[PDB]
């Protein structure tokens, strides 16, 4: 598709149609000759619009923890402005002259600027989103650089304990991005990566189990192979990590 | 009474309880419980929706019944309608 995630694309996409068919009509001649109603009400709409969202994205930037969203967000408020001040103008101009050939311009680019503006805060919010998803993988990610430590069963039973609900919530957090996502070999990567972080997870356990068995008496294939299982899940979780940052 | 070689060596030695917590905490490892952590998502595609809607009721003002388009879609309506009834009868309702 033309959007990554469903959301994004339900919100542009029957936008950017209308605005499509329109430039189409004005080429065709369809619109010559022909008087504008007032458009200062319907931009009143687009202008109270175009406001609660800058309101609602300033206020993400303000509460965020996120460094990277305060920093890419931010032009994208500028961007819906300066095309909303294009869509008083075109309206104006139609206001002063109701056939005015200069304003279709002004119409179009106001309308698209709104929009391109609309889509680069979605796009920036879905980025943080994702890093949100990213911090939970690159948690199991050195939670699991940690299972070479455990050489007691007092351990082990510790360590299994507390991974439960970081994989339960990585497990959690990929089954609704999933969900969302147009891409369907993207989907299919992300299902199988988890998956497989999950059906190695007993036996990553019970490779840990021998270690610290075989490191009562009489090691290195107990050794070998809860690394193997570590390097696996790794590599299988940093697949999840380049997957979630895919946008085409 | 503890021994001092012991002591000094293991002081600063994390345990697998104190590193474990460090990771679960800067990482966010755990459930979380409350109903405001879609809310942020929500309002931002809310708003977003209503820009879209405000700027598509603005062109189709400003296209009138000049427009060529037509989206009446009686057989996905169709589909939904047959969707919900069948749901509805294996609901009991």
């Known amino acids: 598709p033309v959007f990554h995630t469903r959301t994004i694309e339900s919100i542009l996409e029957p936008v950017a149609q209308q605005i499509s068919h329109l430039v189409i009509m004005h080429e065709e001649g369809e619109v010559d000759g022909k008087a504008i109603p007032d458009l200062t009400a319907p931009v009143a709409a687009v202008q109270a619009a175009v406001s609660n969202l800058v309101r609602v994205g300033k206020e993400t930037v303000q509460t965020t923890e996120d460094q990277i969203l305060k920093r890419d967000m931010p032009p994208a408020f500028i961007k819906v402005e300066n095309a909303c001040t294009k869509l008083v103008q075109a309206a104006q101009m139609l206001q002063s002259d109701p056939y005015s050939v200069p304003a279709r311009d002004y119409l179009i680019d106001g309308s698209r600027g709104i929009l391109s503006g609309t889509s680069d805060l979605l796009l920036t919010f879905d980025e943080a989103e994702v890093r949100k998803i990213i911090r939970v993988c690159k948690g199991i990610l050195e939670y699991l650089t940690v299972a070479e430590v455990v050489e007691t069963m007092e351990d082990l039973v510790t360590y299994t304990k507390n991974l439960g609900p970081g994989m339960t919530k990585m497990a959690k957090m990929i089954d609704e991005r999933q969900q969302e996502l147009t891409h369907q070999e993207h989907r299919v990567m992300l299902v199988n990566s988890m998956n497989t972080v999950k059906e190695l997870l007993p036996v990553l356990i019970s490779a840990m189990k021998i270690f610290v068995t075989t490191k009562n008496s009489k090691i290195e294939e107990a050794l070998k192979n809860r690394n193997f299982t570590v390097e696996k899940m790794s590599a299988e979780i940093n697949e999840i990590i380049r997957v979630l940052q895919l946008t085409s | ?93």
């Open chain 2, 1 to 93: 009474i503890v021994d001092p070689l012991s002591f000094s060596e293991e002081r600063f030695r994390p345990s697998l309880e104190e590193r474990l917590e460090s990771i679960i905490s800067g990482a966010a490892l755990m459930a979380d419980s409350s109903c405001t952590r879609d809310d942020r998502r929500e309002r931002i595609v809310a708003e977003c929706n209503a820009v879209r809607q405000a700027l598509q009721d603005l062109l189709s003002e400003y296209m009138g019944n000049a427009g060529r388009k037509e989206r009446s879609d009686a057989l996905n309506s169709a589909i939904d309608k047959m969707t919900k009834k069948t749901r509805d009868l294996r609901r009991q309702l």
